[PDB]
Structures are given as structure tokens and as C-alpha cells.
Swiss-Prot record:
Protein name: Proto-oncogene tyrosine-protein kinase Src
Localization annotation: Cell membrane; Mitochondrion inner membrane; Nucleus; Cytoplasm, Cytoskeleton
Illness association: SRC kinase activity has been shown to be increased in several tumor tissues and tumor cell lines such as colon carcinoma cells.
Modified residues (Phosphotyrosine): 43
Note: May be involved in blister formation in Pemphigus vulgaris, phosphorylated-SRC is abundant at blister sites but not in normally adherent tissue, which corresponds with loss and disruption of CDH1 in cells adjacent to blisters. Phosphorylated SRC is increasingly abundant at pre-lesional sites of blister formation and occurs prior to changes in abundance of CDH1 and DSG3.
Protein family: Belongs to the protein kinase superfamily. Tyr protein kinase family. SRC subfamily.
Tissue expression notes: Expressed ubiquitously. Expressed in the skin (at protein level). Platelets, neurons and osteoclasts express 5-fold to 200-fold higher levels than most other tissues.
Native source species: Homo sapiens (Human)
Post-translational modification note: The phosphorylated form is termed pp60c-src. S-nitrosylation is important for activation of its kinase activity.
Reported function: Non-receptor protein tyrosine kinase which is activated following engagement of many different classes of cellular receptors including immune response receptors, integrins and other adhesion receptors, receptor protein tyrosine kinases, G protein-coupled receptors as well as cytokine receptors. Participates in signaling pathways that control a diverse spectrum of biological activities including gene transcription, immune response, cell adhesion, cell cycle progression, apoptosis, migration, and transformation.
Residues covered by the SH2 domain: 7-104
Shown chain mapped onto the complete sequence: 145 to 250 of 536
Gene name for this UniProt entry: SRC
Entry domain remark: The SH2 and SH3 domains are important for the intramolecular and intermolecular interactions that regulate catalytic activity, localization, and substrate recruitment.
Oligomeric form and interacting partners: Part of a complex comprised of PTPRA, BCAR1, BCAR3 (via SH2 domain) and SRC; the formation of the complex is dependent on integrin mediated-tyrosine phosphorylation of PTPRA. Interacts with DDEF1/ASAP1; via the SH3 domain. Interacts with CCPG1. Identified in a complex containing FGFR4, NCAM1, CDH2, PLCG1, FRS2, SRC, SHC1, GAP43 and CTTN. Interacts with ERBB2, STAT1 and PNN. Interacts with DDR1, DDR2 and DAB2. Interacts with CDCP1, TGFB1I1 and TOM1L2. Interacts with the cytoplasmic domain of MUC1, phosphorylates it and increases binding of MUC1 with beta-catenin.
């Protein structure tokens, strides 16, 4: 169960995920998974990034879950679980601003 996962912050807003992630000490790829504020049955993967242009900033990717069972940010790349998705994205940047590195501190 994802609710048991330490990177699962459940019902928090986008602003709040940005408040937690916009901390000077978070390295690129700090992340958390939360509920989508407006897309039901979707989660949101909030991820911190950093570059000399934008400085420290956050990106939000919608995680869809099919009734067919798979989870995904892009339908081309599916997984049997949220946990597997997270693990995959901890190893590949793909279309993300950065590979998942560290669970957003509280
Ligand atoms: N599409 C879209 C879309 C566009 C703007 C959004 C603003 C706040 C929260 C949202 O949902 P989320 O970040 O997924 O919690 C949004 N979703």
C-alpha cells in the first residue's frame, strides 16, 4: 500500500508540495507523491529541480492508474505498481526534470 510508503504524502496541495520542496537543502530530484488536486484517480509526483536560469524550482507530473492495472506518467511506459514506477524513475530521468533522488523531508 502506497499510503504506507514514506514518499507518499497523500492529500496535500500543489502549493504545499512546493513549500516542502523549495528548500535550499533539497538536491535535484527530491520528491513526493500526493493526490492530484483535480484529476481523480490520478496522483502527482512533485519533483525538485535546480539550474542557473531558474534556480530552485518544482515540477509536477500526473501519475495515471488504469483499471487494467498499470500506473504511468506516460502511457508508453507502464508499471505494475506505484512502487515500481518510483524505482524506475529513481534510475531514469526520461522526460522528468531529474531522476528521483531523495524523499522530501518533512
Ligand atoms: N492539467 C492540469 C492542472 C493544471 C493546473 C493545476 C494547478 C493546481 C493543481 C493541479 O493539479 P495537480 O498539480 O495535479 O495537483 C493542476 N492541474
Amino acid at each position: 500500500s502506497i499510503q504506507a510508503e514514506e514518499w507518499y504524502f497523500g492529500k496535500i496541495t500543489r502549493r504545499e508540495s512546493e513549500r516542502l520542496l523549495l528548500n535550499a537543502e533539497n538536491p535535484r530530484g527530491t520528491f513526493l507523491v500526493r493526490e492530484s488536486e483535480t484529476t481523480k484517480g490520478a496522483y502527482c509526483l512533485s519533483v525538485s529541480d535546480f539550474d542557473n536560469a531558474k534556480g530552485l524550482n518544482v515540477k509536477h507530473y500526473k501519475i495515471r492508474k488504469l483499471d487494467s492495472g498499470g500506473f504511468y506518467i506516460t502511457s508508453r511506459t507502464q508499471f505494475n505498481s506505484l512502487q515500481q514506477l518510483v524505482a524506475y524513475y529513481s534510475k531514469h530521468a526520461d522526460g522528468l526534470c531529474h531522476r528521483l533522488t531523495t524523499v522530501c523531508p518533512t
